[PDB]
Every structure is written in C-alpha cells, then in structure tokens.
Write a protein that binds this ligand. Structure first.
Ligand SMILES: *[C@@H]1O[C@H](CO)[C@@H](O)[C@H](O)[C@H]1NC(C)=O
Ligand SMILES: *[C@@H]1O[C@H](CO)[C@@H](O)[C@H](O)[C@H]1NC(C)=O
Length: 201
C-alpha cells in the first residue's frame, strides 16, 4: 500500500502551533461541544462522602488550521492523530479527583476527542428521604485555560450518556442531568457544565 497519509500529516502540522487557538479570525471563540458518558459507578464511599466513576469526556470542535480537500489526498476524509499534537480546549473536572488518547480529525476541521477518565468527586446524602438511601453527587467540567471569550461550551445533551453503563450491584442511578453555568472568579467569565447525580440505595 501507498500512503499519502504521511503527506497530509506533514502538510497539516508543518507550522502548526498547538498553543494558538485554531480559529480563522482572532475575534472568534472556539465552540466545544461537550457531553459526559458514564461507563460505571465504581464505588460510593459513604464514609468520606466520595464517589469514584469511570467516564468518557466527549469533546468535539473545529480546528480551522486542519482542513483539507480529500481529493488532494487520495480521498482521505478523516484521520487519527495524537492529542499531544493538537490544540486542546483543556476541559477538566474542577474539584480535583483525563488520559491522553488519540483524536480523530476530519477534512473540514472537526476534531472528535473522547478521552477516558476515572474520578473521585464529592457527594451529599439526601436527608429528606428515609431510610437514607439517596445521595446527591455533582461533577463540574469546564476549561481551565480559556475564558468564555475564547472557548464557549455547548452542552450536547441534558442527560449523561449511559447506554454502555454497568449497573453495579450496590447503587442505582436515579437521575443524571447536565446544566450549563457561566460563573467563575476574577475579571473573567468562564463557562462550565454541572452534572447532578441522584444515587439510590
Ligand atoms: C465535518 O464532516 C462531518 C462528517 O464526517 C460532520 O459531522 C461535521 O459536522 C463536519 N464539520 C463541520 C465543521 O461542518
Ligand atoms: C438532592 O437532589 C434531589 C434531586 O435533584 C433534590 O430534590 C434535593 O433538593 C437535593 N438536596 C440536596 C440536599 O442535595
């Protein structure tokens, strides 16, 4: 086989600077579509009010530097590229608790990144219900480096993605909904997404 896959890569990352936002015009914000997918609830530590989860952080955005006509490159329309090479919006889980997988890049600039993660975030037993088999657990995600001027978050679904979720014997997910906030400290606006989990038993 003969791969102009190597030519596209050399042409795509020639003078690429992963630290410059890959916008066309410098006035532009980069829109990052975001969604949380849960694989399983690993453990609910009722003592320390903590929760550990296995999740994927679904991210998608446009990198206007990484755009090509497939006709020039043997009809390639998509390629897999290491996340370490790309500009990233640097979305993190806020209350410290995102492995560097590879990214998919498409000839129109769309980048799809879904890195897996394992987190231990804080919980809160619901005292309104007796017996006490409810817990309120929140996960808050947003860019660390870029304010809303430079990265805007778009929440792709009101619900956490659970199609591939593993029900663990000991707790059940009553609800898991995401909502957008735009609140952070300083003379800067920072958009974020809060996911609220209601766990039973
Ligand atoms: C690029 O093409 C894909 C289909 O492969 C599509 O899902 C995506 O919306 C396109 N990107 C843009 C920025 O239109
Ligand atoms: C816990 O979550 C439930 C469901 O969203 C809500 O009705 C309740 O007000 C919350 N209370 C606390 C203390 O978290």
């Amino acid at each position: 086989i003969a791969e102009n896959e190597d030519a596209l890569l050399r042409h795509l990352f020639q003078g690429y600077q992963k630290w410059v936002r890959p916008v066309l015009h410098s006035n532009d914000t980069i829109k990052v579509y975001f969604g949380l997918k849960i694989s399983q609830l690993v453990d609910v530590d009722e003592k320390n009010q903590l929760m550990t989860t296995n999740v994927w952080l679904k991210q998608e955005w446009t990198d206007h530097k990484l755009r090509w006509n497939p006709d020039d490159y043997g009809g390639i329309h998509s390629i897999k590229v290491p996340s370490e090479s790309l500009w990233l919006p640097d979305i993190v889980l806020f209350e410290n608790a995102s492995l560097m997988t590879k990214v998919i890049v498409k000839s129109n600039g769309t980048v799809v990144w879904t890195p897996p993660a394992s987190y231990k975030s804080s919980c809160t037993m619901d005292v309104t219900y007796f017996p006490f088999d409810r817990q309120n657990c929140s996960m808050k995600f947003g860019s660390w480096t870029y304010d809303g001027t430079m990265v805007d978050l778009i929440l792709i679904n009101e619900n956490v993605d659970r199609k591939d979720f593993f029900d663990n014997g000991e707790w059940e997910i009553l609800n898991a909904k995401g909502m957008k906030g735009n609140r952070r400290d300083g003379v800067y606006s920072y958009p974020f997404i809060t996911y609220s989990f209601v766990l039973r038993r």
